Amino acid sequence: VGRVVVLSGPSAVGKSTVVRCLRERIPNLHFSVSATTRAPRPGEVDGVDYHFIDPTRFQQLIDQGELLEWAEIHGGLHRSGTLAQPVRAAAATGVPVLIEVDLAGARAIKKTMPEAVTVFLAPPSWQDLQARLIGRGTETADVIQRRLDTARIELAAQGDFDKVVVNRRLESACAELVSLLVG
Numbered sequence: 001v002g003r004v005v006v007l008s009g010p011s012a013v014g015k016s017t018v019v020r021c022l023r024e025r026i027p028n029l030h031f032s033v034s035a036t037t038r039a040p041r042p043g044e045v046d047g048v049d050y051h052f053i054d055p056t057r058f059q060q061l062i063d064q065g066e067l068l069e070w071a072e073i074h075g076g077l078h079r080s081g082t083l084a085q086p087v088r089a090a091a092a093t094g095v096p097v098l099i100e101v102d103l104a105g106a107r108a109i110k111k112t113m114p115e116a117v118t119v120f121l122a123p124p125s126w127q128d129l130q131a132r133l134i135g136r137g138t139e140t141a142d143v144i145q146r147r148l149d150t151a152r153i154e155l156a157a158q159g160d161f162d163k164v165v166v167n168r169r170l171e172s173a174c175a176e177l178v179s180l181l182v183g
C-alpha cells in the first residue's frame with residue numbers, strides 16, 4: 001500500500017519548488033490531479049493538470065461523497081478539489097501519493113481520509129517568514145500587515161497536523177518528505 005501525504009502550510013508561500021523536487025526524487029510519485037469546473041487553458045491536458053468537469057457533475061461528486069475536499073474558487077466563480085478514487089486507487093496499486101492543498105483542504109482531507117498523513121511545512125523562524133512576506137516592499141503597508149496577520153493565524157494552527165517539517169534547507173525538507181512518502 002502506497003502512503004498518502006497531504007502537504008500544506010502558510011498560504012502566502014508557494015510550495016511548487018518542493019513539489020517539483022519530490023517528483024524528481026520519487027520517480028513514480030503520483031501528484032494528485034485536482035478536479036475543477038473552470039475550463040482548460042491551452043497547454044492544459046485533461047487528466048494531467050486538472051480533471052476538467054462541468055458544474056453539474058462536480059455537484060454529483062459532492063453529493064455522492066467523492067471529493068476528499070473541495071472549495072469555491074474566486075468567490076464561487078468555479079470549484080476545485082481532490083477526488084477520492086484516484087487517490088485510493090493509486091495507494092492500493094502501491095504508488096505513493098502527494099496532495100498539496102491549502103490548510104482548509106488538508107483539514108477536510110484528514111476527516112474524509114484519516115489514514116492520510118498531514119504535513120505542515122513550517123518556516124525556520126517567524127523572522128524568516130516575515131522577511132519573505134515584506135519581500136521587495138512593493139506592496140502597501142495594509143496588504144503586508146494583512147499577510148503577517150494571516151501568517152501568524154496559520155502558524156498558530158500547525159498543531160492540527162500529523163507532522164511538521166521545518167523548511168530549514170530545501171534538500172533536507174525534501175528528504176524528510178521523501179521519508180514520509182516511502183520510508
Ligand SMILES: Nc1nc2c(ncn2[C@@H]2O[C@H](COP(=O)(O)OP(=O)(O)O)[C@@H](O)[C@H]2O)c(=O)[nH]1
Binds near residue numbers: 069070082
Ligand atoms: N480546495 C482546493 N483548492 C484548489 C485545488 N486545486 C487548486 N485549488 C485552488 O485554486 C487556485 C488557483 O488555481 P491555478 O491558478 O490554476 O493554479 P493553483 O494556484 O496551483 O491552483 C489555488 O490557489 C488553489 O488554492 C483543490 O484541489 N482543492
